[PDB]
Amino acid sequence: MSGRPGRVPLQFLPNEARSLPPPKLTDPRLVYMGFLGYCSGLIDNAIRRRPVVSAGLHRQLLYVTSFVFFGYYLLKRQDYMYALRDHDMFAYVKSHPEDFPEKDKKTYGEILEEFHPVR
Amino acid sequence: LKIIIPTTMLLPMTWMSKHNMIWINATVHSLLISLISLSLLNQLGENSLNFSLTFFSDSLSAPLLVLTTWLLPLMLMASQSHLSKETTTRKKLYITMLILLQLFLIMTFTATELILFYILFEATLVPTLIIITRWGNQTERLNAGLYFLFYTLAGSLPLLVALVYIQNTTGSLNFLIIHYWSHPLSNSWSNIFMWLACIMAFMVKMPLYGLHLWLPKAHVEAPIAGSMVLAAVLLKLGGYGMMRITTILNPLTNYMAYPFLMLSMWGMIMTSSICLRQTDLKSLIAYSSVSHMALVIVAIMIQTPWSFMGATALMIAHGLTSSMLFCLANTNYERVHSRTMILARGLQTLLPLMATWWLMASLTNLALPPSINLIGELFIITASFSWSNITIILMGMNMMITALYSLYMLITTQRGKYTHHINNIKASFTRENALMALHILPLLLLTLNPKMILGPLY
Amino acid sequence: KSASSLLDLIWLETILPKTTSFIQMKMSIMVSNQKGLIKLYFLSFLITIMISMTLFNYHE
Amino acid sequence: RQWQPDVEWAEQFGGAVMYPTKETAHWKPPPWNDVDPPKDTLVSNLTLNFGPQ
Amino acid sequence: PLVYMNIIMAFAIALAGLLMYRSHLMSSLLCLEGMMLSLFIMSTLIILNTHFTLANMMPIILLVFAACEAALGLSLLVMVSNTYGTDYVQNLNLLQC
Amino acid sequence: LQYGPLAFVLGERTTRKLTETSKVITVDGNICSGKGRLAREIAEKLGLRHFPEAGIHYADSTTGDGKPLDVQLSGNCSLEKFYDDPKSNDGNSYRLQSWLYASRLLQYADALEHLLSTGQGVVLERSIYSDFVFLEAMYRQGFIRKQCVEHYNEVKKVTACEYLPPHVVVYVDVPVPEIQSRIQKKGNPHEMKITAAYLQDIENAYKKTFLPEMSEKCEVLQYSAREAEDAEKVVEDIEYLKCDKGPWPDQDDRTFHRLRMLVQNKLEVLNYTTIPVYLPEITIGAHQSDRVFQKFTELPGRKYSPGYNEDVGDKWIWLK
Amino acid sequence: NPIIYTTLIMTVMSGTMLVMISSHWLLIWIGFEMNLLAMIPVLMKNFNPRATEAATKYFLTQATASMMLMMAIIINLLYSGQWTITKMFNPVAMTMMTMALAMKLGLSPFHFWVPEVTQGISLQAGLLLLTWQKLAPLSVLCQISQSINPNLMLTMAMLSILIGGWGGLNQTQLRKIMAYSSIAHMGWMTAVLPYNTTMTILNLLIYITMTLAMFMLLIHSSATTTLSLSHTWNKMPVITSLMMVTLLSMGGLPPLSGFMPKWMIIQEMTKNESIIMPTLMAMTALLNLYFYMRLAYSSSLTMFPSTNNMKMKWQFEHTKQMKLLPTMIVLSTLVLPMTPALSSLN
Numbered sequence A: 001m002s003g004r005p006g007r008v009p010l011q012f013l014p015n016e017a018r019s020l021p022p023p024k025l026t027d028p029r030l031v032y033m034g035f036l037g038y039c040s041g042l043i044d045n046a047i048r049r050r051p052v053v054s055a056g057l058h059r060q061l062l063y064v065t066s067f068v069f070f071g072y073y074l075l076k077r078q079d080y081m082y083a084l085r086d087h088d089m090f091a092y093v094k095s096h097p098e099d100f101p102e103k104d105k106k107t108y109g110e111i112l113e114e115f116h117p118v119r
Numbered sequence B: 001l002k003i004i005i006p007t008t009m010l011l012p013m014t015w016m017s018k019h020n021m022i023w024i025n026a027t028v029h030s031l032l033i034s035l036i037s038l039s040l041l042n043q044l045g046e047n048s049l050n051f052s053l054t055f056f057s058d059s060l061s062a063p064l065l066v067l068t069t070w071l072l073p074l075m076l077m078a079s080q081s082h083l084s085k086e087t088t089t090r091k092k093l094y095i096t097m098l099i100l101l102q103l104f105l106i107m108t109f110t111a112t113e114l115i116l117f118y119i120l121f122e123a124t125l126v127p128t129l130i131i132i133t134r135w136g137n138q139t140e141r142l143n144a145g146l147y148f149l150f151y152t153l154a155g156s157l158p159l160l161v162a163l164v165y166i167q168n169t170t171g172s173l174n175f176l177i178i179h180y181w182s183h184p185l186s187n188s189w190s191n192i193f194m195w196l197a198c199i200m201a202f203m204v205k206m207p208l209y210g211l212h213l214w215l216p217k218a219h220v221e222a223p224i225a226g227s228m229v230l231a232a233v234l235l236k237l238g239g240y241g242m243m244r245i246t247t248i249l250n251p252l253t254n255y256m257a258y259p260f261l262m263l264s265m266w267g268m269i270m271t272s273s274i275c276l277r278q279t280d281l282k283s284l285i286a287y288s289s290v291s292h293m294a295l296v297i298v299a300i301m302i303q304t305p306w307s308f309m310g311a312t313a314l315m316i317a318h319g320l321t322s323s324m325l326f327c328l329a330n331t332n333y334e335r336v337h338s339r340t341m342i343l344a345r346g347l348q349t350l351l352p353l354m355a356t357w358w359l360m361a362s363l364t365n366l367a368l369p370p371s372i373n374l375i376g377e378l379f380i381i382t383a384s385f386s387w388s389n390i391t392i393i394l395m396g397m398n399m400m401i402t403a404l405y406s407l408y409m410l411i412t413t414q415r416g417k418y419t420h421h422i423n424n425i426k427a428s429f430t431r432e433n434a435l436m437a438l439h440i441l442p443l444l445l446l447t448l449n450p451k452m453i454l455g456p457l458y
Numbered sequence C: 001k002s003a004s005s006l007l008d009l010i011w012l013e014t015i016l017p018k019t020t021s022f023i024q025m026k027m028s029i030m031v032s033n034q035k036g037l038i039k040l041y042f043l044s045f046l047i048t049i050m051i052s053m054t055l056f057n058y059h060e
Numbered sequence D: 001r002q003w004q005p006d007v008e009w010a011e012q013f014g015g016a017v018m019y020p021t022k023e024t025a026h027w028k029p030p031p032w033n034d035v036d037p038p039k040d041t042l043v044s045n046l047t048l049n050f051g052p053q
Numbered sequence E: 001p002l003v004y005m006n007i008i009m010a011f012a013i014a015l016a017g018l019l020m021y022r023s024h025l026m027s028s029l030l031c032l033e034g035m036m037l038s039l040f041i042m043s044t045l046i047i048l049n050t051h052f053t054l055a056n057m058m059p060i061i062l063l064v065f066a067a068c069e070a071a072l073g074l075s076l077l078v079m080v081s082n083t084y085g086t087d088y089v090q091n092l093n094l095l096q097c
Numbered sequence F: 001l002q003y004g005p006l007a008f009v010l011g012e013r014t015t016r017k018l019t020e021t022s023k024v025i026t027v028d029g030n031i032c033s034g035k036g037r038l039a040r041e042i043a044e045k046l047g048l049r050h051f052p053e054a055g056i057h058y059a060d061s062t063t064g065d066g067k068p069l070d071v072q073l074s075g076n077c078s079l080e081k082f083y084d085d086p087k088s089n090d091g092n093s094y095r096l097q098s099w100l101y102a103s104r105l106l107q108y109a110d111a112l113e114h115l116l117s118t119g120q121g122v123v124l125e126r127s128i129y130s131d132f133v134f135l136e137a138m139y140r141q142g143f144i145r146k147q148c149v150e151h152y153n154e155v156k157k158v159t160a161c162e163y164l165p166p167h168v169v170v171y172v173d174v175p176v177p178e179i180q181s182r183i184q185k186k187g188n189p190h191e192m193k194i195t196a197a198y199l200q201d202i203e204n205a206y207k208k209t210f211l212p213e214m215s216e217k218c219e220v221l222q223y224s225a226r227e228a229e230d231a232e233k234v235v236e237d238i239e240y241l242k243c244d245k246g247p248w249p250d251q252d253d254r255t256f257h258r259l260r261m262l263v264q265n266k267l268e269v270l271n272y273t274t275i276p277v278y279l280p281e282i283t284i285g286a287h288q289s290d291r292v293f294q295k296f297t298e299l300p301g302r303k304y305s306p307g308y309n310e311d312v313g314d315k316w317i318w319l320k
Numbered sequence G: 001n002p003i004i005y006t007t008l009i010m011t012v013m014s015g016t017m018l019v020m021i022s023s024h025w026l027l028i029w030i031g032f033e034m035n036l037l038a039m040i041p042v043l044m045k046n047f048n049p050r051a052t053e054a055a056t057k058y059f060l061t062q063a064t065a066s067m068m069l070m071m072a073i074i075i076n077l078l079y080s081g082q083w084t085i086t087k088m089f090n091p092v093a094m095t096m097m098t099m100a101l102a103m104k105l106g107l108s109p110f111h112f113w114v115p116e117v118t119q120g121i122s123l124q125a126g127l128l129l130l131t132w133q134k135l136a137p138l139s140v141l142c143q144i145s146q147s148i149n150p151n152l153m154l155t156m157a158m159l160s161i162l163i164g165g166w167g168g169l170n171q172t173q174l175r176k177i178m179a180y181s182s183i184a185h186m187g188w189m190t191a192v193l194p195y196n197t198t199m200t201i202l203n204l205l206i207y208i209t210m211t212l213a214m215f216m217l218l219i220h221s222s223a224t225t226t227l228s229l230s231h232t233w234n235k236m237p238v239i240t241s242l243m244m245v246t247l248l249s250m251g252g253l254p255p256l257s258g259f260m261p262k263w264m265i266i267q268e269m270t271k272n273e274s275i276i277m278p279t280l281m282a283m284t285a286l287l288n289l290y291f292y293m294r295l296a297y298s299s300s301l302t303m304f305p306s307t308n309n310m311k312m313k314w315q316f317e318h319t320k321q322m323k324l325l326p327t328m329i330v331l332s333t334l335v336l337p338m339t340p341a342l343s344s345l346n
């Protein structure tokens, strides 16, 4: 991570993160973060003792848009870190066969797992 | 999954509705959501009903959710005795807590992950202490919140460390995966503490003899809505947990069970004997709940097919009746403005129908046949007797006391001679009588075909 | 006398819950009760330094 | 009416330490303005004896 | 070498001197000031020894901020000496609570 | 948009706006001594703003429509009850003084805010520096308990410390026998219920404490009763006054910035008037607090923020 | 004068940023003074005897830690000859640094300064001290986490959690208990620091956001004592409602976002075979939960007697806008379902 080769510091979504499928606008994680924008909208009028459901909708609309915007790139970075974590992981096992052997998976007919009577 | 979204959908329901329609609108949609919940006992065979990656149901959960979804209307009309004088926002926020509570219990039972279960399992606490402390009546309701929550976390937190440990070792804790990828528990000293950590969290939310000080310290002072929901489903959250977590705790369960089931065995006689000597009416059902709740502790510990069925049968049946006796506690308490048992006596000559509800409540808690209380208790006896022959002399001696205090409350309150100086009891409204009816009828008419209630092992 | 008063109301509630409640209560006082003198604070920082690198010797 | 806290219950956690002891029994909760009042005047201008030499 | 030993134990007693207040803050403040003199001499000893030309930088630049720390230090002591009059750390406890 | 730290950076100064006639002046006198008239004449003569003596509902005058709200909703204290039965067990005496102190405290803050903002001089009847004397007269008559005095001097020292004395203070000297004649002529039935010892007690604590310590803090003008009617004469002295004695001259723009920021944040202004001292009279119980506050809510123009209440008629709410 | 107070606040931010962007051991120290130089003025902005009290107490410990921090670097120079920010090559020097940085953070018995200073200074400066200076030492600890002594840092972390949360239920001033609560949160992030640095940042961010949300709420309520906060229910009951919601958030009960670090911290520690240590810190975190509810008990969940003059406060309204308050509250309570975002930090 903080030391992987070919990394540009302070660089957000890089030139290969775009190879992954983008999160959909109907992403359940994304809309929930939009719901946090909706929640952060209504509470604002509570401190300022304003109608919590029918006050200035410009604040509420701007509260939701900001959350849904910054979330989308975070949700893009979300998968890219996991994809990068998954990518290098599979290269290591391929490059180090001796640390990850394949046991000859044998059926339960041969397995001597003992029986515990409960009574 | 089709239950949760409408359950969340009641959150805007109550919070927006007109000043006088909040309870009407909340009452109906809680009654309508019992439809979609009632389609959850609708079940396939031995395979569980898995309808989503994160949510699943089986014959053990199915009675539970239909209990909670049914339950919320009961606390809705129950709270319509003392919330009338409160402000609208406080009234709306009371529904918010109850609806938020539903959203949790409706989701713990459907959780297919141990941590997701645990996250929501202890998440139900946050709505509770709001109910007990904010809307409580007496003075020591403040001490009620500390006793309830600290007892719960002191056992729940080591379970969280245990769960992540299992996550790292075997790889996953999905309720199916651990069942299929089972592994016997070695007698290593480390496994003993892991077993203890896994079980202790559900023990504290399963009043054990010694880990039960919060039972009389929470139910008595809690509001009426909080009292039944904490006694009817909240105590069962551990019951669901132990039935599930025991799949990975064998064979260490059988050898390690002796310190625990026996403490439940001896205390369940003791706790029932406590009810024989009581001064507070609401303390009767609290302590009676402890003895009944501790009965299934033995059943789950034996891990016997009959015991599990009896545990589930008693689990729902006790929750229904324990909630009922709390409603009858409320009506008498509201009329007399006191919780003392010996104060209000001879109430049957004034409220004949209320006496009949008292009769049915105490007699069902007495666990006569064919009531679900008896069939659940009888299955436990047979399983316990197979485990050991002496078990009958103890758990049978509980039924000795169980019949006593059940009739003791009936005799001293309804029967006898009325106290003359009480000039407060009016005729009972149609609310409580319907509230009692909505408690008694589902229990009785479930008796014809209780096989939705026995559980997955049926 | 034995079931309710002795065990539940007295013994069972004084063994586990109130003891730990008192254990935190018994000596949380001077945890918060400090004289406020810079002398006592910085003298304590001295001992923490010596115990770290000389007595228990995390380096060694 | 449900029991609401009274004045006496308010004084429980109302002192400098809600959990007091003899060591802190003589303490004094901080002033609400968070400013201690000025103490005794501390001017000590020295006296210079000009003259007669 | 032995010269290094002499001036790191200069730190040690300076370390002991700083976090040991007896009567007044001024003596401790001076000990904090003099504490960097060993720090100056310490850092200076390696840098001429090792002939690293650039890092002759830091002995002077350590002197910029160490004495600047003292500069705000004794100027803070001015604020004490008006409200408190004296400069005693024993009296310096009005936040007992 | 009101003057904050941003305005100071942009260029909004306040020592530029003030002028020679930028004086805040308080008139003082005994009970119904006619000083309120003198405040009016000096205000209009030099073009100074007049602030009437702050009553129980003065806070109601600066909030909403400026009309006196219900006493039970705006203090639960009546000056008439203070007049009729001073030793009432409910404790209306300290409820009068403590509430009136904050009303004067709000009066003083608004007067200084106007003086610091526009620079046009402000004249108000009495002040917080003249408020302690009324309570001192009360304690000197058995009117009040000593713990009430301790609470009042605590909050007064806490709240009035960072404020500055007013530019000029002018007092009219009317003797007690003359004062008794004036109130008797008034005919308001509540003000026969007075004590001559109380009237000398309030008079004594003026000239013994108020005027002495106020002298070194700002200029004092002791004025005779007959001289007061000559509204022409009383104003020439205040016109050509030294206006140098006190902390008013040594006041830079930065300390003026702190003063304006304090007075403009009205909640802070009387924030410490609600000290958690749990006096038996001062404290209002929880159920009363909720019900009275719950009452305050549906009063028109109170449920939401100003300019946002539908019952008032505020439109454009969905985009306000 | 406000224009200058922007500059010293900027320099404190600039000095902190200098620490977290410097690759030279020298410049890392330079940022600490840049923080230290301009901190004392904003610490005694109100100019109270308590302000001078706290300012002097802050300076003595902080100057000692920074001064101890050089020859920790200098012995590294003696035995490595490297100025670059990497793992340390001499053990005794780096053990010396760990004490120095713990002094800045206030973890060990070194922690005595932070609760003392927080009370004397105002709430606004208390927030800045308690939410901004917890980054510069964190950055240095994050960098040198390679060769960090496990026993040394774990012992420091345990004590910071223990005394941090044990004396918390003994202070009636809110500014004190948060300093006490912060030391407990200081221990939580520092305990994971030797094992995995990523979860330290997440716990830092989660603790920081809650630190604003509470301190920012406190300024709006203008409270100094628990009784003073208790009176808030009679003016803005909603504000007192978010009060308790944040308390349970800082307690760590799900779904509230305060369960974020406690859930994430014990994960890799159990992965790292450290299991007894996670159990103890979790159980003693209930000490934090105790005085959290007690403040919630006195503020929101129950009423409290009010004063007569309190009624007039209803007539007037607050003038401070108190920017970014609603976002902090939501970001401090409803965040748990978005857990995988720790990868974004990673």
Ligand SMILES: Nc1nc2c(ncn2[C@@H]2O[C@H](COP(=O)(O)OP(=O)(O)OP(=O)(O)O)[C@@H](O)[C@H]2O)c(=O)[nH]1
Pocket: F029, F030, F031, F032, F033, F034, F035, F036, F037, F053, F079, F096, F097, F100, F101, F104, F125, F131, F134, F135
């Ligand atoms: N306790 C108290 N009573 C006040 C205060 N201001 C006025 N009063 C009462 O007001 C009543 C009338 O006396 P004053 O207000 O002094 O004078 P007035 O009758 O308005 O006449 P002028 O002095 O000419 O303005 C008396 O009952 C006073 O005690 C005050 O600040 N506190």
Ligand SMILES: [Mg+2]
Pocket: F032, F033, F036, F053, F125
């Ligand atoms: Mg008058």
